Design an enzyme around this catalytic site. Structure first.
Site, PDB file in Angstrom:
ATOM      1  N   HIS A 114      87.272  10.148 138.220  1.00 40.52           N
ATOM      2  CA  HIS A 114      85.939   9.567 137.984  1.00 40.52           C
ATOM      3  C   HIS A 114      85.511   8.569 139.061  1.00 40.52           C
ATOM      4  O   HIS A 114      84.331   8.253 139.160  1.00 40.52           O
ATOM      5  CB  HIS A 114      85.844   8.892 136.614  1.00 40.52           C
ATOM      6  CG  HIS A 114      85.987   9.837 135.466  1.00 40.52           C
ATOM      7  ND1 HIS A 114      85.199  10.956 135.319  1.00 40.52           N
ATOM      8  CD2 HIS A 114      86.824   9.821 134.402  1.00 40.52           C
ATOM      9  CE1 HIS A 114      85.550  11.594 134.218  1.00 40.52           C
ATOM     10  NE2 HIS A 114      86.534  10.927 133.642  1.00 40.52           N
TER      11      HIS A 114
HETATM   12  O1  TFG Z   1      84.960   9.583 127.700  1.00 41.67           O
HETATM   13  C1  TFG Z   1      85.437   8.540 128.151  1.00 41.67           C
HETATM   14  C2  TFG Z   1      86.558   8.720 129.166  1.00 41.67           C
HETATM   15  C3  TFG Z   1      86.824   8.004 130.271  1.00 41.67           C
HETATM   16  C4  TFG Z   1      87.837   8.501 131.021  1.00 41.67           C
HETATM   17  C5  TFG Z   1      88.372   9.641 130.543  1.00 41.67           C
HETATM   18  C6  TFG Z   1      89.494  10.513 131.138  1.00 41.67           C
HETATM   19  O2  TFG Z   1      88.860  11.588 131.869  1.00 41.67           O
HETATM   20  O3  TFG Z   1      90.258  11.168 130.112  1.00 41.67           O
HETATM   21  C7  TFG Z   1      90.391   9.768 132.132  1.00 41.67           C
HETATM   22  F1  TFG Z   1      89.670   9.383 133.194  1.00 41.67           F
HETATM   23  F2  TFG Z   1      90.926   8.716 131.547  1.00 41.67           F
HETATM   24  F3  TFG Z   1      91.345  10.583 132.539  1.00 41.67           F
HETATM   25  S1  TFG Z   1      87.560  10.041 129.152  1.00 41.67           S
HETATM   26  N1  TFG Z   1      84.813   7.408 127.801  1.00 41.67           N
HETATM   27  C8  TFG Z   1      83.680   7.523 126.860  1.00 41.67           C
HETATM   28  C9  TFG Z   1      84.036   6.929 125.524  1.00 41.67           C
HETATM   29  N2  TFG Z   1      84.712   5.638 125.697  1.00 41.67           N
HETATM   30  C10 TFG Z   1      84.964   4.622 124.784  1.00 41.67           C
HETATM   31  C11 TFG Z   1      84.513   4.708 123.463  1.00 41.67           C
HETATM   32  C12 TFG Z   1      83.917   3.590 122.880  1.00 41.67           C
HETATM   33  C13 TFG Z   1      83.429   3.650 121.581  1.00 41.67           C
HETATM   34  C14 TFG Z   1      83.516   4.837 120.858  1.00 41.67           C
HETATM   35  C15 TFG Z   1      84.089   5.965 121.440  1.00 41.67           C
HETATM   36  C16 TFG Z   1      84.584   5.905 122.741  1.00 41.67           C
HETATM   37  C17 TFG Z   1      85.605   3.650 125.425  1.00 41.67           C
HETATM   38  N3  TFG Z   1      85.789   4.014 126.702  1.00 41.67           N
HETATM   39  C18 TFG Z   1      85.260   5.215 126.910  1.00 41.67           C
HETATM   40  C19 TFG Z   1      85.211   6.055 128.211  1.00 41.67           C
HETATM   41 ZN    ZN Z   2      89.301  13.231 130.481  1.00 40.20          ZN
END
Ligand code: TFG
Ligand code: ZN
Ligand code: K
Ligand code: K
Length: 360
Positions: A114
């Site tokens: 990202h």
């Molecule tokens: O979808 C993501 C991800 C960020 C990074 C993701 C990844 O691709 O799995 C990585 F980079 F860690 F490998 S997945 N979010 C959106 C939801 N979120 C939250 C949430 C906050 C409140 C409710 C649900 C989710 C905190 N931080 C995030 C970042």
């Molecule tokens: Zn992911």
């Protein structure tokens, strides 16, 4: 020994058992670590990081200013861990690329895909996989690199990093749902720019969780989109942003799909058919410990050339759901303009694996 490489470093750990420590332990307990060559990692240099990121970004997050995980110094350490994660990946990539090792799996954190030129986001500070590719280009003059990204989220940084470069094929499989899933980028129509037109492939799944995408849908996407295009491209090295958040056990917003860990062994084995087997996988997302440990095991086992657990007959016989077929057919339609393997025929995307084989 000319075998599978691993890279791991305890200086990436938060507390100085999380995700990368659980994966490392699984590889030890199952005996797979015993069959691999574990290499020593290192911090990436500021110059290496600057192949992708700005000087200002690299200076800020790459330099030490001089640990309670509930303070700001947790994030300072994570940025340090990111600098180290990039040098671990670079080192493994180069050892495989020079023939010192056959292939490899990098057990690293935080993830990288990202991270944009001068913007950290989605837990990512530096784009490790993208930096590896740039260094393979600049230092070894590698002519063709395929980057496959099978984390459930679009790899916005890696797409950006190579968007006008036709010498690097970027292929992302992700939940898209018409722009309503994080990070919101990676529409099928994003095909590249300038000379790089046609060398960016967004295998974007739309339609939501009605039903969720599973093994049959990803195997079909590999059969119809990924391997045809990847084979025609004919890369010299393969790099994988190997996130496992598509595996069953990752709930609706931070996941939502029902892949099996076993399926990633088969996806790896397919990719092992390209580039002479010059393949490196780097851990991205996924967070359910059992799921990511099962998946990492299946991938390493595949890389070592072990006999894989057969997929259930149910999966081999399953026709992909209509949302998945619709999504694949939209991608193929766009990329028929650029690839000969998609100009020749009509769609067979609705067939199961057995049906696709039988009709051949
Ligand atoms: O979808 C993501 C991800 C960020 C990074 C993701 C990844 O691709 O799995 C990585 F980079 F860690 F490998 S997945 N979010 C959106 C939801 N979120 C939250 C949430 C906050 C409140 C409710 C649900 C989710 C905190 N931080 C995030 C970042
Ligand atoms: Zn992911
Ligand atoms: K992806
Ligand atoms: K590209």
């Amino acid at each position: 020994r000319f075998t599978t490489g691993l890279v791991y470093d305890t200086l990436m750990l938060k507390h100085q058992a999380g995700r990368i420590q659980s994966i490392w332990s699984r590889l030890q307990e199952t005996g797979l670590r015993g069959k691999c060559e574990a290499i020593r990692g290192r911090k990436a240099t500021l110059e290496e990081l600057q192949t992708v990121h700005s000087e200002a970004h690299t200076l800020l997050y790459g330099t030490n200013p001089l640990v309670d995980s509930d303070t700001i110094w947790n994030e300072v350490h994570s940025a340090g861990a990111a600098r180290l994660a990039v040098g671990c990946v670079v080192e493994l990539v180069f050892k495989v690329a020079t023939g010192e090792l056959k292939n490899g799996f990098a057990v690293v954190r935080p993830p990288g895909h990202h991270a944009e030129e001068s913007t950290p986001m989605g837990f990512c500070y530096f784009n490790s996989v993208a930096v590896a590719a740039k260094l393979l280009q600049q230092r070894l003059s590698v002519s063709k690199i395929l980057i496959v990204d099978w984390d459930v989220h679009h790899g916005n940084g890696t797409q950006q990093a190579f968007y006008s470069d036709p010498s690097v094929l970027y292929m992302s499989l992700h939940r898209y749902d018409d722009g309503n899933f994080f990070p919101g980028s990676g529409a099928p129509d994003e095909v590249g720019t300038g000379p790089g037109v046609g060398f960016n492939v967004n295998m974007a799944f739309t339609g939501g969780l009605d039903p969720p995408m599973g093994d049959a849908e990803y195997l079909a996407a590999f059969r119809t989109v990924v391997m045809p295009i990847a084979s025609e491209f004919a890369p010299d090295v393969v790099l994988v942003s190997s996130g496992f958040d598509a595996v069953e056990g990752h709930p609706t917003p931070l996941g939502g799909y029902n892949l099996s860990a076993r399926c990633f062994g088969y996806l790896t084995k397919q990719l092992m058919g390209l580039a002479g087997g010059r393949i490196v996988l780097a851990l991205e997302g996924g967070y359910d410990l059992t799921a990511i440990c099962d998946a990492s095991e299946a991938c390493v086992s595949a890389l070592l050339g072990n006999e894989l657990d057969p997929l259930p007959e149910k999966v081999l016989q399953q026709r992909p759901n209509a949302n998945a077929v619709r999504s694949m057919e939209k991608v193929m339609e766009i990329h028929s303009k650029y690839w000969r393997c998609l100009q020749r025929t009509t769609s067979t995307a609705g067939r199961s694996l057995i049906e696709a084989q039988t009709c051949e």
